[PDB]
Design an enzyme around this catalytic site. Structure first.
Site, PDB file in Angstrom:
ATOM      1  N   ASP A 338       0.833  -1.191   0.000  1.00 14.16           N
ATOM      2  CA  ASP A 338       0.000   0.000   0.000  1.00 14.16           C
ATOM      3  C   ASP A 338       0.873   1.248   0.000  1.00 14.16           C
ATOM      4  OD1 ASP A 338      -2.130   1.789   0.231  1.00 14.16           O
ATOM      5  OD2 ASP A 338      -2.147   1.649   2.418  1.00 14.16           O
ATOM      6  N   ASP A 679      -2.086  -0.756   6.044  1.00 19.10           N
ATOM      7  CA  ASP A 679      -2.433  -0.221   7.353  1.00 19.10           C
ATOM      8  C   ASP A 679      -3.861   0.310   7.389  1.00 19.10           C
ATOM      9  OD1 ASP A 679      -1.903   2.004   5.706  1.00 19.10           O
ATOM     10  OD2 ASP A 679      -1.448   3.244   7.456  1.00 19.10           O
ATOM     11  N   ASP A 683      -7.306  -2.817   3.080  1.00 14.91           N
ATOM     12  CA  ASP A 683      -6.270  -3.813   2.854  1.00 14.91           C
ATOM     13  C   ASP A 683      -6.559  -5.147   3.524  1.00 14.91           C
ATOM     14  OD1 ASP A 683      -4.567  -2.033   1.372  1.00 14.91           O
ATOM     15  OD2 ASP A 683      -4.009  -1.102   3.281  1.00 14.91           O
TER      16      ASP A 683
HETATM   17  F1  ALF Z   1      -4.112   3.516  -0.731  1.00 18.94           F
HETATM   18 AL1  ALF Z   1      -4.256   2.785   0.904  1.00 18.94          AL
HETATM   19  F2  ALF Z   1      -4.379   2.052   2.542  1.00 18.94           F
HETATM   20  F3  ALF Z   1      -3.948   4.388   1.654  1.00 18.94           F
HETATM   21  F4  ALF Z   1      -4.576   1.183   0.151  1.00 18.94           F
HETATM   22 MG   LIG Z   2      -2.985   3.059   3.713  1.00 19.99          MG
END
Ligand code: ALF
Ligand SMILES: [Mg+2]
Ligand SMILES: CCCCCCCC/C=C/CCCCCCCC(=O)OC[C@H](COP(=O)(O)OCC[N+](C)(C)C)OC(=O)CCCCCCC/C=C/CCCCCCCC
Ligand SMILES: CCCCCCCC/C=C\CCCCCCCC(=O)OC[C@H](COP(=O)(O)OCC[N+](C)(C)C)OC(=O)CCCCCCC/C=C/CCCCCCCC
Ligand SMILES: CCCCCCCC/C=C\CCCCCCCC(=O)OC[C@H](COP(=O)(O)OCC[N+](C)(C)C)OC(=O)CCCCCCC/C=C\CCCCCCCC
Ligand SMILES: CCCCCCCC/C=C\CCCCCCCC(=O)OC[C@H](COP(=O)(O)OCC[N+](C)(C)C)OC(=O)CCCCCCC/C=C\CCCCCCCC
Ligand SMILES: CCCCCCCC/C=C\CCCCCCCC(=O)O[C@H](COC(=O)CCCCCCC/C=C/CCCCCCCC)COP(=O)(O)OCC[N+](C)(C)C
Ligand SMILES: CC(C)CCC[C@@H](C)[C@H]1CC[C@H]2[C@@H]3CC=C4C[C@@H](O)CC[C@]4(C)[C@H]3CC[C@]12C
Ligand SMILES: CC(C)CCC[C@@H](C)[C@H]1CC[C@H]2[C@@H]3CC=C4C[C@@H](O)CC[C@]4(C)[C@H]3CC[C@]12C
Ligand SMILES: CC(C)CCC[C@@H](C)[C@H]1CC[C@H]2[C@@H]3CC=C4C[C@@H](O)CC[C@]4(C)[C@H]3CC[C@]12C
Ligand SMILES: *[C@@H]1O[C@H](CO)[C@@H](O)[C@H](O)[C@H]1NC(C)=O
Ligand SMILES: [K+]
Ligand SMILES: [K+]
Ligand SMILES: [K+]
Lengths: 986, 277
Positions: A338, A679, A683
């Site tokens: 990520d 995080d 995700d």
């Molecule tokens: F783009 Al993200 F957690 F900030 F997948």
């Molecule tokens: Mg993130």
């Protein structure tokens, strides 16, 4: 499973579909029958297996089936003996030991077996408890669970959205869809169709998302598990029940060993049937085969090895929730990471500032102490003053001795970034803001895109009014007729405007949000000190300004991320960035981190460079690719496979959590072990489907930390390279441990084979070989896990999961045939020495077992004619068994020494560098000395005291084993890939 | 490939051949250190065991005088053992020497070395086993209630039994000690209630003494001294309760003769005799 999104419909079509009214809502009867039919607005927890069945299923996995069969055979042998009046016992002991081994191995395997748990507990922090819903045109507070689709709900600022709604009336509503995109940037809301994709349609509120400010009214469209966060939780809880690579390797090893044991047992049972043996003798032989060919202590030793590695990694602030996950990082071939929170610091920070027609670069590190970018140059004082004064954000209380970048700030993200910058580079702007009096004007209205603040200078010399203004750079320039370059002011030259515009374009190209700055001193001739100011902007001018400078913000990567990514790519791992951010920011961060190198160039960049059509350029030239969400939503799986296979550097942008899951699954279709770092809530499905999931500790969310197999407490992304180091070292030392464990099975199996075939007296008993399996080999098995790296671990390519196995044919062949046979030979030399030195020559022991074990005969004639009572015969048998045990132990010392290395030599690696090896050798010394001269002083468990010379007969065989292994490793070293590397290396 | 298969098979053949050669060489080097005339150690056989001849399986004797098949096994076993003790097989004088009928000191026939050739064995004649020799008594006593078992001492090379000196009180006076030349042997009931039913005990030894003469010792090892006839002691009961099981223990007394709780045959018997009607 509903996906017929209809945000295109107007208010009336929503009314007709859902049968409600904005003024009225839903009647109480209507709502109650909805609550009956559709179901409560609550995320349904999943069904979980209770822990006791999870514990009981461990008693049939591993080598436990064979041990259970052996225990059953022991009980059958005992009942047969008891029928024939045989109080010898010696079999209840074996059955009890086997059952205890099964119980202990099941306990260890349960300790190693995952953690289970559910993600629903993490979502409780976001789910609202109540909701202001209207029924029969009355505003009442109703619990969010009772809320059902179709009713009109009103949302204020600062509270969670009760459910998935379709906004109909809105007034300055800004939501925070960080759970769907991972970004904390406030997203505006409206009552009109904006985008085809419901995730960006701008007129739909989402369940559990927070409304930052403003009021809104919407019709609920989905409730409970049918909401977007509902599907996210359902996916994050309904996937990931799959084996880990280390589990698959251990299962394959168990399959090989169990197959060998079953084949040998079946064939030798058939031979015993074909040689006129009683059924009791056959089943006793079968029990001995089963016990000898099963490495009972190995499956617990692997667990202890993983536990030791987990503790020494958690010492480095890397919590490992799943014990099996220490290995996976290291066999990983793809890291899907990520962007925001993981690669970047999740904090808006100024990166570039433009003045004097030059681009300056600012430090962006989290622990930075000071900034130095040609500060002594001109125009910097005016820029400093305009940045300090033209700001609204303020620091939070209770921050006397807090690190500057870690200080909580109330205000906008941009305002927070400028305020942090001013505090860092000036130190104390509170005094500067106090001393410069602020006129009560600060128009920050929407649709203006600029704000200005009038101040009076505290300097006695000047003592003139100041009007500092910042905002959108185009609006700043159109209100500017001059630019301050090194003190004095140039006119609005065409060249100066060109420089401004090209700086704008390039700063946008680096994916940064620029802000223009301009100030205009008000001479006291036209504006007196007592001149009144009005908020209407009519009492003061807002034109003929002077442009000072231009700053941009990046949300920069963490300090340790670029070096860690470079090391990961140098270790043969392919890093992929999967993010929910816009493609421009994602591409800029990828170039700034190392996911896309400076020389590498994408299709769009080639098209821009050659000015040709994007379809005209051949995709073979491009070495990088950026794929948005739309390009992936309509992509056939073969196309995704080809996209992953072709491009080495890929970036995914504007991806939903389901699309992240799709990417992870597609990467796993290539027979690759993937790791996911994240995080956020979005995700969690990826963090579960991935072979190993890593989550941040400080910046992470609860759902991500619950769905991950490993958590980085200090958010040090550099821990990934150490994890890969540890995983590869674990794989190598596990090969060594398995070889050292399997090598002692053959010395335990050969005596029973010879006893059946040639009819010798029993060279060793079953309890004796259980003592080898459980007592002597465990500590050296732990010791072999402390071996240091033989070669450059972090320079190899990741192992191929299908092609490369933990236990291949080479290791098994070398452990059973090349070694093990030598140990059996040395043990038999010791056994024949023990028997011959007391009267029974080697050739007189052939086919003597029938008369040897006959309690009726008490005058057995040996080679010298002496007559032996039955008890003296079995005492000599126990002496021979103990001596054979000692021979196995000493040759296992030699084999520990030779298993310390696999390609190197003991001269190079060092004999004493690993002190746990010597602890294991001392432990074997103590255990054998006890088992010989304690238990054995009283004859028990087939152990007797040994003469001094019987402790050293097998030492030359240990030396021979060491010399042979040294020669083998030397010839492997000298001629690589020369039929000796291919056949003898394990 | 076929060439690869040939190379791997050649490697394994030479490797296993070398391992077998090393094993055989170590066996030969170990065997070079053991003598073919006397054992290196006598740790386990130093205290000799005591064994009876009928070679009963479960330490029990159950037979009926009426049916011949009831004692046929014991009679055949006694005949098989005592066949080699017949004087017809001991007539040759080149390998047998007639040692006197009175017990004497142990005979030292040289030393355990290849020199001096073979040895000469004292002859043991069946006549000394009165009414259990099989010369003029059929069934070896297994008529109505007259069992008799031949007791022997296990053979040990270089073993000279040391009979107990009559200084300390051994048992009730036997009226003839002759300690320096006879190893005492006595059979008694196991516990108190079997002494009332065991009956009298008749011992038939060489010279009329109740024990093993020392003139037959030491044994020399089936190579220096083959065809060695160990002394025998036939013990006959002649009086025992019918349809009752009696546990009888025979013990050999001596300074050097040892006993053991773990080993039940180290100078002791646990024999049971039941005579069915
Ligand atoms: F783009 Al993200 F957690 F900030 F997948
Ligand atoms: Mg993130
Ligand atoms: C990987 C695991 C390996 C395990 C190995 C177990 C091997 C078991 C075999 C044991 C027998 C070993 C014999 C070796 C003896 C030395 C070699 C030799 O030169 O000895 C010649 C023998 C005499 O030696 P001695 O004992 O009298 O010496 C006494 C010592 N001193 C001379 C000082 C008095 O000559 C004689 O009298 C006898 C002549 C006739 C011999 C016939 C033997 C027939 C037996 C066949 C059974 C084979 C079974 C094979 C099973 C394999 C399964 C994998
Ligand atoms: C009296 C009884 C005594 C018993 C003593 C112990 C017996 C057992 C000892 C060893 C057996 C080990 C069995 C290993 C089985 C593996 C199972 C498996 O999972 O297989 C997967 C492998 C994959 O191969 P790969 O791609 O990694 O290979 C690449 C080769 N490269 C690099 C040249 C291209 O498949 C393969 O290798 C093909 C495997 C082919 C195996 C053929 C049979 C080999 C067994 C021989 C033992 C015969 C009896 C010996 C008794 C001696 C008494 C003196
Ligand atoms: C029975 C139970 C099992 C018994 C099994 C025994 C197997 C033999 C064990 C031999 C142990 C040897 C000790 C040893 O090798 O320690 C190694 C150390 C240091 O190694 P390094 O600094 O050279 O490594 C340089 C590393 N790099 C090249 C990366 C810079 O060196 C030293 O402590 C001093 C020794 C210097 C190197 C050897 C010089 C000649 C000495 C030979 C005596 C030992 C071998 C002959 C006897 C074998 C047994 C009969
Ligand atoms: C590569 C070699 C160098 C590396 C190893 C170095 C080891 C160093 C260790 C030395 C400690 C020696 C053991 C302690 C001292 C000897 C104890 C002993 O007394 O040990 C002698 C035994 C034979 O006893 P004996 O007949 O002298 O006793 C006669 C008793 N009496 C007189 C009452 C009849 O010697 C035997 O077993 C000999 C056994 C032969 C087979 C071993 C393997 C040979 C293959 C090569
Ligand atoms: C006495 C103490 C114990 C001693 C144990 C001895 C272990 C080692 C034994 C044999 C290995 C010898 C060969 C080392 C290098 C191989 C080079 C090679 O295999 O070349 C290969 C062709 O070779 C062959 O067809 C023959 C293969 C070797 C056969 C060896 C003899 C047969 C088996 C003997 C084992 C005996 C074990 C007995 C142990 C008994 C218990 C202790 C191909 O070479 P290339 O064209 O790829 O060159 C590469 C070019 N470049 C270097 C520039 C990259
Ligand atoms: C003469 C005797 C001892 C030879 C015995 C050879 C046996 C024990 C070896 C040789 C080939 C081996 C098999 C080769 C292939 C497989 C398939 C794998 O998925 C499980 C292990 C298994 C099933 C192995 C079990 C053990 C095996 C059967
Ligand atoms: C490389 C060589 C030295 C390895 C061999 C280790 C041997 C020689 C060591 C390890 C364990 C030791 C034995 C442990 C137990 C006893 C019993 C004690 O009452 C006498 C010493 C004795 C007999 C020790 C003798 C030496 C010994 C046998
Ligand atoms: C000595 C006799 C009785 C038994 C030994 C048979 C040995 C020499 C033969 C039989 C089958 C053979 C194996 C067949 C399969 C493999 C797997 C391959 O990847 C390496 C060679 C290897 C490991 C061969 C090594 C030699 C082998 C093990
Ligand atoms: C057995 O032999 C003894 C020898 O004295 C003899 O007295 C006795 O009568 C014999 N017993 C019988 C009845 O055969
Ligand atoms: K084992
Ligand atoms: K996982
Ligand atoms: K083992």
């Amino acid at each position: 499973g509903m996906d017929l999104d209809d945000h295109r419909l107007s208010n009336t079509e929503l009314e007709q579909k859902y049968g409600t009214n904005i003024i009225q809502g839903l009647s109480s009867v209507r709502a109650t029958e909805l609550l009956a039919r559709d179901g409560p607005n609550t995320l349904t927890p999943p069904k979980q297996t209770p822990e006791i069945i999870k514990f009981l299923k461990q008693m049939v996995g591993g080598f436990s089936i064979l041990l259970w069969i052996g225990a059953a055979l022991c009980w059958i042998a005992f009942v047969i003996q008891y029928v024939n009046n045989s109080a010898s016992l010696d079999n209840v002991y074996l059955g009890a030991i086997l059952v205890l081994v099964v119980i202990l191995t099941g306990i260890f395997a349960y300790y190693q077996e995952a953690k289970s748990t559910n993600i629903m507990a993490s979502f409780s922090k976001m789910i609202p408890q109540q909701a202001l819903v209207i029924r029969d045109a009355e505003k009442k507070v109703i619990s969010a669970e009772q809320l059902v689709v179709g009713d009109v709900v009103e949302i204020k600022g600062g509270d969670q959205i009760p459910a998935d709604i379709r906004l109909v009336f809105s007034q300055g509503c800004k939501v925070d869809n960080s759970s769907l995109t991972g970004e904390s940037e406030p997203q505006a809301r409206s009552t009109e169709f904006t985008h085809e994709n419901p995730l960006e349609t701008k007129n739909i509120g989402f369940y559990s998302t927070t409304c930052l400010e403003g009021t809104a009214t919407g019709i609920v469209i989905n409730t409970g598990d049918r909401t977007i966060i509902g599907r996210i939780a359902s996916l994050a809880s309904g996937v990931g029940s799959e084996k880990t690579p280390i589990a698959i390797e251990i299962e394959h090893f168990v399959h090989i060993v169990a197959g060998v044991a079953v084949s040998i047992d079946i064939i030798f049972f058939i031979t015993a049937v074909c040689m006129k043996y009683y059924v009791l003798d056959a089943i006793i032989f079968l029990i001995s085969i089963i016990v000898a060919n099963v490495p009972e202590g190995l499956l617990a030793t692997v667990t202890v090895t993983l536990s030791l590695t987990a503790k020494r990694m958690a010492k480095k602030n890397c919590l490992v929730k799943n014990l099996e996950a220490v290995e996976t990082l290291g066999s990983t071939s793809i890291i899907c990471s990520d962007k925001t929170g993981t690669l970047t610091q999740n904090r808006m920070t100024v990166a570039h500032l433009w003045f004097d027609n030059q681009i300056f670069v600012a430090d962006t590190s989290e622990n930075q102490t000071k900034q130095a970018f040609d500060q002594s140059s001109g125009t910097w004082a005016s820029l400093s003053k305009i940045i300090t004064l033209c700001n609204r954000a303020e620091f939070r209380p209770g921050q006397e001795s807090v690190p500057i970048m870690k200080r909580t700030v109330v205000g906008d993200a941009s305002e927070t970034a400028l305020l942090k910058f001013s505090e860092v580079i000036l130190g104390d702007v509170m005094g500067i803001r106090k001393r410069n009096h602020k006129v009560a004007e600060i128009p920050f209205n929407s649709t203006n895109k600029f704000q200005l603040s009038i101040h009076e200078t505290e300097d006695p010399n000047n003592k003139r009014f100041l009007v500092v203004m910042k905002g959108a750079p185009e609006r700043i320039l159109e209100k500017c007729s001059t630019i301050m370059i090194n003190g004095q002011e140039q006119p609005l030259d065409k060249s100066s405007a060109d420089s401004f515009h090209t700086a704008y374009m390039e700063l946008g190209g680096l994916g940064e949000r620029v802000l223009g700055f301009c100030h205009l001193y008000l001479p006291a001739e036209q504006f007196p000190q007592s001149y009144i100011f009005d908020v209407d902007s009519v009492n003061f001018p807002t034109s003929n300004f002077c442009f000072v400078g231009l700053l941009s913000m990046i949300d920069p990567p963490r300090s340790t991320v670029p070096d860690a990514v470079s090391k990961c790519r140098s270790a043969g791992i392919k890093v992929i960035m999967v993010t929910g951010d816009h493609p421009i920011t994602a591409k800029a961060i990828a170039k700034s981190v190392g996911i896309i190198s400076a020389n590498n160039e994408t299709v769009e960049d080639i098209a821009k460079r050659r000015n040709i059509a994007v379809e005209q350029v051949n995709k073979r030239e491009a070495k990088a690719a950026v794929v948005t969400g739309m390009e992936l939503k309509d992509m056939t799986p073969e196309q995704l496979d080809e996209l992953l296979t072709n491009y080495q550097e890929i970036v995914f942008a504007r991806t939903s959590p389901q699309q992240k899951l799709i990417i992870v699954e597609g990467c796993q279709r290539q027979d690759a072990i993937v790791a996911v770092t994240g995080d956020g809530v979005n995700d969690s499905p990826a963090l579960k489907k991935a072979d190993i999931g890593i989550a941040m500790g400080i910046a992470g969310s609860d759902a991500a930390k619950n769905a991950a197999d490993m958590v980085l407490l200090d958010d040090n992304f550099a821990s990934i390279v150490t994890g890969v180091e540890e995983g590869r070292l674990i794989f190598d030392n596990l090969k060594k441990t398995i070889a050292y464990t399997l090598t002692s099975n053959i010395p335990e199996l050969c005596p029973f084979l010879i006893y059946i075939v040639a009819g010798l007296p029993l060279p060793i008993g079953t309890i004796t070989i259980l003592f080898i399996d459980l007592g002597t080999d465990i500590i050296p098995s732990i010791a072999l896990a402390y071996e240091k790296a033989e070669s450059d671990i972090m320079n190899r390519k990741p192992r191929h999961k299908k092609k490369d196995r933990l236990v291949n044919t080479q290791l098994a062949i070398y452990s059973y045939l090349h070694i093990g046979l030598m140990q059996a030979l040395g043990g038999f030399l010791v056994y024949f020495t023990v028997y011959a030195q007391q009267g029974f020559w080697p050739t007189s022991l052939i086919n003597l077992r029938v008369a040897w074990e006959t309690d009726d005969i008490n005058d057995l004639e040996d080679s010298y004619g002496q007559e032996w009572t039955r008890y003296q015969r079995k005492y000599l048998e126990w002496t021979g068994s103990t001596a054979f045990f000692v021979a196995i132990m000493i040759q296992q010392w030699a084999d520990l020494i030779i298993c310390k290395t696999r390609r190197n030599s003991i001269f190079q690696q060092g004999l004493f560098r690993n002190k746990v090896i010597w602890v294991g050798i001392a432990s074997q010394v103590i255990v054998a000395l006890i088992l010989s001269y304690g238990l054995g002083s009283v004859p028990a468990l087939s152990f007797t005291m040994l003469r001094v010379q019987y402790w050293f007969v097998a030492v030359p065989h240990a030396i021979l084993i060491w010399v042979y292994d040294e020669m083998r490793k030397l010839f492997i070293r000298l001629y690589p890939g020369s039929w000796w590397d291919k056949n003898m290396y394990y | 490939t076929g060439g690869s298969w040939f190379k791997i098979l050649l490697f394994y053949v030479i490797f296993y051949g070398c391992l077998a050669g090393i094993f055989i060489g170590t066996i030969q080097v170990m065997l070079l250190t053991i003598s073919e005339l006397k054992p290196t150690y006598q740790d386990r056989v130093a205290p000799p065991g005591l064994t009876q001849i009928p070679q009963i399986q479960k330490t029990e004797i159950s037979f009926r005088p009426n049916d011949p098949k009831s004692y046929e096994a014991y009679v055949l076993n006694i005949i098989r053992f005592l066949e080699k003790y017949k004087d017809s097989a001991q007539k040759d004088d080149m390998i047998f020497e007639d040692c006197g009928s009175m017990p004497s000191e142990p005979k030292e026939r040289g030393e355990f070395n290849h020199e001096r050739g073979e040895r000469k064995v004292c002859r043991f004649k069946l006549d000394w086993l009165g009414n259990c020799s099989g010369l003029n008594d059929e069934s070896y006593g297994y008529k109505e209630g007259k069992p008799c078992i031949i007791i022997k001492l296990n053979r040990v090379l270089g073993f000279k039994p040391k009979p107990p000196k009559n200084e300390s009180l051994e048992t009730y006076p036997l009226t003839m000690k002759y300690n320096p030349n006879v190893l005492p042997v006595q059979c008694t009931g196991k516990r108190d209630e079997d002494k009332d039913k065991v009956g009298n005990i008749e011992y038939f030894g060489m010279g009329g003494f109740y024990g093993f003469p020392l003139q037959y010792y030491p044994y020399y090892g089936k190579l220096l001294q083959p065809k060695y006839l160990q002394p025998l002691l036939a013990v006959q009961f002649t009086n025992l309760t019918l349809d009752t099981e009696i546990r009888i223990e025979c013990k050999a007394y001596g300074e050097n003769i040892g006993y053991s709780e773990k080993d039940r045959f180290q100078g002791r018997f646990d024999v049971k005799i039941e005579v069915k009607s």
